[PDB]
């Protein structure tokens, strides 16, 4: 029948030979379920993804778990389809591995469950949405200075005591609310310790009921770490496709995705390319990234956390990645120290979308201005700490004045912050966001004490904040 047998085992790479010219196609799943026939063997249960057809009825395969215990001769079975995984409400509030098995303790998914193959061609040209429409996150800094695009790819930079988890959490919340969109979180090769923390942080923030999670952590063989982004992608695709939602896809450390790729490539016997990477780098990225988009129905927006190989951004992996990014969100451990949370750098965070052709003069004009006024203030500091604030070229003081209100007005009440602040949380829409900064720039609030625009929402709240200590 469609039964192959193990021929070789080179670490995670396993070759299987199939009789009767059955030959499973590329990307098909192969289960090895062996029970030890004696005390000199071990019980095996392993899925292998077919990688190539080497000839002589042999397929080189990449195992999704550890190959310890394999014995040349073990029989392999062809599932007929690529690694398929549960999609739907059933995945929400739950954590799973690459294979699609839950790894939380809430019991197992039913066999009735729909399961989609992780490998699938991206939307057809005719199927994509034509107009570039910005996705509103109700977060000032974001929506003004580095507008996220519905379906694009945002690079999240910064992630050590800067509020990276709060921002993700606050995002999963707003979209789920004001947009009715589920989020999906894919952890790719990056500290189990952290995966645990975030999961729990999601219990308390309560945002976990609006998010399915997949972890293919740092202890996973190359195959596991490489495919988890596809699993979590599929689970998310079901909403955009079937339930036309504008959902989210968080991938924590996509770099580990490519690293996992090269780690396998070498083992398959591929000619190393630049910096020992796989000759296949670009292609593997594009195939993952081209599914993340807005079709006629819904959309998939991804916020990929990027962690470059020791400060270097010219390294193949990230070099490749940036070619797909539509915006960058840089969280800085400076604005955070000042207490300006979200610590989203208003001058480094950039967007392909801050163009009047998309946001109009109203938004754009105000934006480049907030970015410019901050320029003066940023460069003056050195002059400040030397000659003081005394008589700083009239207008320049006017800027140092207005600026300080501006950078402060950029912080916000995160709904997930109430957990420990008391303040409920905001959701300022870009329309009100622009206005707030519009009037501020007009100096129409130059008579208020800094802390008045501190940690609020619209510009109204600043006035309400006024009737407190002044």
Partner 1 sequence: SQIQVSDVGTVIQVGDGIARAHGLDNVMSGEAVEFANAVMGMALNLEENNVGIVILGPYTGIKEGDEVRRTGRIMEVPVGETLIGRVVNPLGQPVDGLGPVETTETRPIESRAPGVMDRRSVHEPLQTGIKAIDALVPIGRGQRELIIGDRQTGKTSVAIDTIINQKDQNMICIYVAIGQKESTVATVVETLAKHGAPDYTIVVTASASQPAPLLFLAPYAGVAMGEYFMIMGKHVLVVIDDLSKQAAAYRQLSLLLRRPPGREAYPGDIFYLHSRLLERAAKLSDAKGGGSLTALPFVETQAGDISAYIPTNVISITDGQIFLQSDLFFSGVRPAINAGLSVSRVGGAAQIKAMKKVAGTLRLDLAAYRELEFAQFSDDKATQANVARGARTVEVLKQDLHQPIPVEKQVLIIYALTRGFLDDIPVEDVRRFEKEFYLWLDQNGQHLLEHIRTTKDLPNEDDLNQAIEAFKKTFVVSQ
Closer Cβ to partner 1, 18 or 409, answer by number: 18
Whether 72 is catalytic: no
* Candidates 17, 31, 115, 191; catalytic one: 191
Whether 120 is catalytic: no
Under rule CB under 8 A, residue 126 binds partner 1: yes
Closer Cβ to partner 1, 377 or 427, answer by number: 377
The answer to whether the beta carbons of residues 226 and 261 sit under 8 Å apart is yes
Under rule CB under 8 A, residue 1 binds partner 1: no
| Residue 160 annotated as binding site | yes
Rounded CA-CA distance 74/21 in Å is: 18
Rounded CA-CA distance 306/55 in Å is: 39
The pairing of beta strand 95-96 with beta strand 148-149: unpaired
The answer to whether the beta carbons of residues 323 and 153 sit under 8 Å apart is no
Closer Cβ to partner 1, 20 or 89, answer by number: 20
| Helix axis angle, 356-387 to 395-409, nearest 10° | 120
Footprint of partner 1 on 134-163 (CB under 8 A)? 151-152, 160-161
The answer to whether the beta carbons of residues 59 and 18 sit under 8 Å apart is yes
| CB of residue 466 to partner 1, shortest distance in Å | 34
Return the residue of 29, 70, 166, 167 that touches partner 1, per CB under 8 A.
70
Burial label, 311 (beta-carbon count in 10 A; 0-12, 13-18, 19+): exposed
Q: Which is nearest to 304 in space by CA: 153, 175, 202, 181?
A: 153
Q: Which is nearest to 306 in space by CA: 288, 291, 320, 290?
A: 320
Phi then psi dihedrals of residue 122, to 5 deg: -70, 165
Footprint of partner 1 on 28-47 (CB under 8 A)? 37-42
Footprint of partner 1 on 344-383 (CB under 8 A)? 350, 352, 355, 357, 368, 379
The pairing of beta strand 246-252 with beta strand 134-135: unpaired
| Residue 2 annotated as binding site | no
Q: Per-residue DSSP letters for 269-284?
A: T----GGG--TTHHHH
- The one segment of 278-286, 424-432, 444-452, 454-462 that binds partner 1 by CB under 8 A: 278-286
Return the residue of 147, 158, 189, 223 that touches partner 1, per CB under 8 A.
189
| Residue 165 annotated as binding site | yes
Under rule CB under 8 A, residue 53 binds partner 1: yes
Under rule CB under 8 A, residue 235 binds partner 1: no
Q: Which is nearest to 412 in space by CA: 461, 363, 350, 464?
A: 461
* Candidates 94, 153, 164, 240; catalytic one: 164
Whether 191 is catalytic: yes
| Residue 187 annotated as binding site | no
Query: Hey, is 172 helix, strand or coil?
Result: helix
Footprint of partner 1 on 304-323 (CB under 8 A)? 307, 309-311, 313-314, 319, 322-323
| CB of residue 461 to partner 1, shortest distance in Å | 31
Return the residue of 19, 104, 418, 442 that touches partner 1, per CB under 8 A.
104
Footprint of partner 1 on 247-276 (CB under 8 A)? 259, 262-267, 269-276
Contacts of 322 (CB under 8 A, 6+ apart): 155, 313
Closer Cβ to partner 1, 179 or 191, answer by number: 191
| CB of residue 205 to partner 1, shortest distance in Å | 16
Return the residue of 113, 132, 392, 463 that touches partner 1, per CB under 8 A.
132
Q: Which is nearest to 198 in space by CA: 249, 164, 155, 235?
A: 164
Report the catalytic residues: 164, 190-191
Binding site as annotated, residues for ATP: 158-165
């Amino acid at each position: 029948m469609t039964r192959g047998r193990v021929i070789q085992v080179m670490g995670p790479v396993v070759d299987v030979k199939f009789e009767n010219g059955h030959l499973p196609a590329i990307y098909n799943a192969l289960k090895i379920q062996h029970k030890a026939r004696n005390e000199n063997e071990v019980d095996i249960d392993l899925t292998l993804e077919v990688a190539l057809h080497l000839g002589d009825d042999t397929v080189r395969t990449i195992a999704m778990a550890s190959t310890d215990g394999l014995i040349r001769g073990m029989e392999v079975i062809d599932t007929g389809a690529p690694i398929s995984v549960p999609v739907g409400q059933v995945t929400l509030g739950r954590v799973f591995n690459v294979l699609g098995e839950p790894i939380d303790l809430e019991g197992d998914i039913p066999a009735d469950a729909r399961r989609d193959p992780i490998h699938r061609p991206a939307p057809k040209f005719e199927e994509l949405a034509t107009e570039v429409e910005i996705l509103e996150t109700g977060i000032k800094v974001v929506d003004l200075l580095a507008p996220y695009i519905k379906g694009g790819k945002i690079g999240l930079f910064g992630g050590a005591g800067v509020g990276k988890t709060v921002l993700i959490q606050e995002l999963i919340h707003n979209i789920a609310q004001e947009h009715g969109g589920i989020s999906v979180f894919a952890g790719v090769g990056e500290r189990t310790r952290e995966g645990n923390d975030l999961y729990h942080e999601m219990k308390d923030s309560g945002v976990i009921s609006k998010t399915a999670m997949v972890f293919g952590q740092m202890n996973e063989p190359p195959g596991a770490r490489m495919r988890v982004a596809l699993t979590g992608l599929t689970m998310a695709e079901y909403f955009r496709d079937e339930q036309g939602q504008d959902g989210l896809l968080f991938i924590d450390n996509i770099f580990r995705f490519t690293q996992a790729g090269s780690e396998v490539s070498a083992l398959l016997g591929r000619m190393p390319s630049a910096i020992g990477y796989q000759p296949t780098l670009a292609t593997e990225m594009g195939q993952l990234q081209e599914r993340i988009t807005s079709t006629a129905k819904g959309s998939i927006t991804s916020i990929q956390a990027i962690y470059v190989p020791a400060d270097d951004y010219t390294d193949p992996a990230p070099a490749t990645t940036f070619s797909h990014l539509d915006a960058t969100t840089n969280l800085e451990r400076k604005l955070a120290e000042m207490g300006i949370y979200p610590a989203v750098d208003p001058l480094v965070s950039t967007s392909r979308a801050l163009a009047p052709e998309i946001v109009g003069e109203e938004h754009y004009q105000v934006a480049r201005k907030v970015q410019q006024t901050l320029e003066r203030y940023k460069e003056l500091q050195d002059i400040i700490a030397i000659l003081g604030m005394d008589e700083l070229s009239d207008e320049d003081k006017l800027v140092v004045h207005r600026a300080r209100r501006i950078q402060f007005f950029l912080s916000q009440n995160f709904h997930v912050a109430e957990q420990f602040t008391g303040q409920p949380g905001s959701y300022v829409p870009v329309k009100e966001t622009v206005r707030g900064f519009k009037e501020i720039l007009e100096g129409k609030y130059d008579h208020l004490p800094e802390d008045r625009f501190r940690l609020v929402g619209r510009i109204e709240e600043v006035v309400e904040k006024a009737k407190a200590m002044g």
